[PDB]
Amino acid sequence: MEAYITEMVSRERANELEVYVYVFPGVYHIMRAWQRANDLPLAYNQHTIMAFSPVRHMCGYTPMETQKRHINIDSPFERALLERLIKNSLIFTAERHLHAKRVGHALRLNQVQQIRQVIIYEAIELYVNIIENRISIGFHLTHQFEYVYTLQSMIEQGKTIRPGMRVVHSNGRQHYTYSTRVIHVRTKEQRLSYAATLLKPLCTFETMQPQDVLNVSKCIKLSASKRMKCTYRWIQQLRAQYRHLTFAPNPFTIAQNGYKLDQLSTPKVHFHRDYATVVSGMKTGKLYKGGNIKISVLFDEDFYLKHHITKKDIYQFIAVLQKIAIAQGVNMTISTSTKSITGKFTDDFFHHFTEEVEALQPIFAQTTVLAFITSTHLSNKKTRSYQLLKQYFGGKWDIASQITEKTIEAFQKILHKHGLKNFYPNDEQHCLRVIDVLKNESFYYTVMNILLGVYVKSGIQPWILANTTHSDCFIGIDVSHENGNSAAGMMNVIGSQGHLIQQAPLNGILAGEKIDDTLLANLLKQMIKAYHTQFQRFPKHITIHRDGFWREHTALVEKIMSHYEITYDIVEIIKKPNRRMAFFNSVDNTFSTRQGTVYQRGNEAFLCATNPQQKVGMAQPIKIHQVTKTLPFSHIIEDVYNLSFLHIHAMNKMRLPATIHYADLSATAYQRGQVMPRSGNQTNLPFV
DNA sequence: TGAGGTAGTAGG
DNA sequence: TACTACCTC
Numbered sequence A: 001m002e003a004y005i006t007e008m009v010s011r012e013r014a015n016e017l018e019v020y021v022y023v024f025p026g027v028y029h030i031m032r033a034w035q036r037a038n039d040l041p042l043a044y045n046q047h048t049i050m051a052f053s054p055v056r057h058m059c060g061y062t063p064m065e066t067q068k069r070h071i072n073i074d075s076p077f078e079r080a081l082l083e084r085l086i087k088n089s090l091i092f093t094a095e096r097h098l099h100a101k102r103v104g105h106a107l108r109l110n111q112v113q114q115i116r117q118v119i120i121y122e123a124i125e126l127y128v129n130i131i132e133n134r135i136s137i138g139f140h141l142t143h144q145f146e147y148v149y150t151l152q153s154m155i156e157q158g159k160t161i162r163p164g165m166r167v168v169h170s171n172g173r174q175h176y177t178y179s180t181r182v183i184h185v186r187t188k189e190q191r192l193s194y195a196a197t198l199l200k201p202l203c204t205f206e207t208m209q210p211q212d213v214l215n216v217s218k219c220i221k222l223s224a225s226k227r228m229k230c231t232y233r234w235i236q237q238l239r240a241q242y243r244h245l246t247f248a249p250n251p252f253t254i255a256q257n258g259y260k261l262d263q264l265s266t267p268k269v270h271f272h273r274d275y276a277t278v279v280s281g282m283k284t285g286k287l288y289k290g291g292n293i294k295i296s297v298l299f300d301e302d303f304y305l306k307h308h309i310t311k312k313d314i315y316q317f318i319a320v321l322q323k324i325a326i327a328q329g330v331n332m333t334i335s336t337s338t339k340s341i342t343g344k345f346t347d348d349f350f351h352h353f354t355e356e357v358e359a360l361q362p363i364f365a366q367t368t369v370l371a372f373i374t375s376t377h378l379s380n381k382k383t384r385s386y387q388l389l390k391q392y393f394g395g396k397w398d399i400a401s402q403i404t405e406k407t408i409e410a411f412q413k414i415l416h417k418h419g420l421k422n423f424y425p426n427d428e429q430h431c432l433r434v435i436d437v438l439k440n441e442s443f444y445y446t447v448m449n450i451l452l453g454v455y456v457k458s459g460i461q462p463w464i465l466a467n468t469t470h471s472d473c474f475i476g477i478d479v480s481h482e483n484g485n486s487a488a489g490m491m492n493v494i495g496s497q498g499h500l501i502q503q504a505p506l507n508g509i510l511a512g513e514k515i516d517d518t519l520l521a522n523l524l525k526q527m528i529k530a531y532h533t534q535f536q537r538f539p540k541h542i543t544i545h546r547d548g549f550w551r552e553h554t555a556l557v558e559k560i561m562s563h564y565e566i567t568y569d570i571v572e573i574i575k576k577p578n579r580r581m582a583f584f585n586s587v588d589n590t591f592s593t594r595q596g597t598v599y600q601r602g603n604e605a606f607l608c609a610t611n612p613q614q615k616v617g618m619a620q621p622i623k624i625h626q627v628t629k630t631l632p633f634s635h636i637i638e639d640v641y642n643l644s645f646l647h648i649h650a651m652n653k654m655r656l657p658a659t660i661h662y663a664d665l666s667a668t669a670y671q672r673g674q675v676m677p678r679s680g681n682q683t684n685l686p687f688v
Numbered sequence B: 001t002g003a004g005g006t007a008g009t010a011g012g
Numbered sequence C: 001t002a003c004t005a006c007c008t009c
């Protein structure tokens, strides 16, 4: 049982390697010509070319000087140039002595399986870094899709083609997506057309026939022991034919990479008592902060004409929700203004939505709206009911909203199977039977997810963290880019235990792709004033979480926040680090992954936070970086892990911590004009 | 869109 | 960043 990482560190140092350096008065074509003529791995940066071996054929270009030298480790220019040379030499050593082809951003290896005109290829990606005078090489394994035939098969052998189809030109190095017959095709609107014997059709999931996406998906889900044993079996074959660097016989363990192993424990949640599991008291507990909710029902008549479900069947569903809500300490009352709008939400109302939507505002104000729109009307690209509802109900008038035919049909199929078809509204001793049949099966999670989405949008806190963290205030920041527009993702967590989780009441529209200084200052000041409002005292420490890389002004975070004599940390959280971690079991020769595992090396860490099943895939590690050093890094990791269990919006555990997950959701929603600011002191998460 | 997690694809 | 498939609860 040893901890394994998909990285290695070379025995040689950055200063133990001698290289040849040429400097010329950008210079891509010189390197290209030298590489073509000499058949040797070269690398270039700005106006300097570096290699491991001298160039024989000079290609008529004169440098100022030639050096057979060691690099200068105190400069970043010669550490960036060298990191590309090992990569290029490894690619060179992969193309020869191994049948690999540099396609896109990866190295296609070989065909593993063909599924009815669909070919799957294995591919690998390599990364080189220079850290602390050590050369680190990381590697990742992926797949690639291709179609067997080309435009010839759609011209010859019958068949035909139609305009708008996406085609792929793959000339080896990189591919573009757009002599018997010439077919025009354009994506950049620049005229181009040529032979239809090498343009293939695109192989994405969306443009793929059924019975394939069901079998092309079982050939990319390698559980834990076939994604890892196959990644190592190729690097260990590339090693045997690489001469410029040397490694240990087993360079994949974390000890060879200088990592430290930490095993975090499962937190506890508090609501009227201490519960070990988040899903342990939702069945048998009382919510931490209850209250009163006035719900509304928006019923569509297309839900009846096309699907044999009567409006009354909506109210024997709500009555099941309320009977569950009276337990846990929540009061739901149906608004009385919905009786004057009977027979109004017809099909023409969805075709004509913008013109006749204002008059709905008075009858839905100060309530929570439950929409029962059809799946088609939400998914259709003409009606676009979901986007309009989000943009009007929440984005304009600030009312929370939360069901298609699949849910109701599954509920009624369950009811019919159990044989209960009598009245289940305003009838005790029978709603309990419906609740019992709902339990012991998987629709209970659907019911509780709906209930939790209603609660968190109504201002109810379902639970907090039983124990206390090492920080006081948590701030989550995120940026979303779409169609040349950027949206910020401010998010506030007040209390060490996670007492009050809300969204910063700030205008998240950004002129640029980064947060302005004034916005950051206002965010910090409002965070301080909101923690003071609830706890009557100023916070002692604050930990800022940033999704991605910290690009803001670090010198300004302290300029205002020192003035309050409060300590702070800045943390970067990276999703998709393009690495994997495992626990190899020598006795059984099988890989596995354990939740709450940390690999630590200085101010950087890899964390495992999820436990997916065999058929879903393999867990994705998270990367944690600490820009500051005010607090121990272990206490930084512990807070990131514990904060991930505060998924009060849903009932299924999420991977990222609460701040950044809700920051991403808030940025996505507020990019689309679906959320508007609301000052207050309650748990407000409308975007979910 | 009940909720979430993983894996592919495209552009920046 | 965005999209699409699947499985799990």
Ligand SMILES: Nc1ccn([C@H]2C[C@H](O)[C@@H](COP(=O)(O)O)O2)c(=O)n1
Pocket (backbone or CB within 6 Å): A479, A481, A547, A548, A549, B012, C001
């Ligand atoms: N493969 C990727 C990864 C990130 N991105 C986006 C997400 C961010 O807006 C930005 C990268 O930011 P960061 O590397 O700090 O996470 O580019 C992308 O467009 N393609």
Ligand SMILES: [Mn+2]
Pocket (backbone or CB within 6 Å): A478, A479, A480, A547, A548
């Ligand atoms: Mn981001």
Ligand SMILES: [Mn+2]
Pocket (backbone or CB within 6 Å): A478, A479, A480, A547, A664, A667
């Ligand atoms: Mn995001």
Ligand SMILES: [Mn+2]
Pocket (backbone or CB within 6 Å): A453, A687, A688
């Ligand atoms: Mn939701």
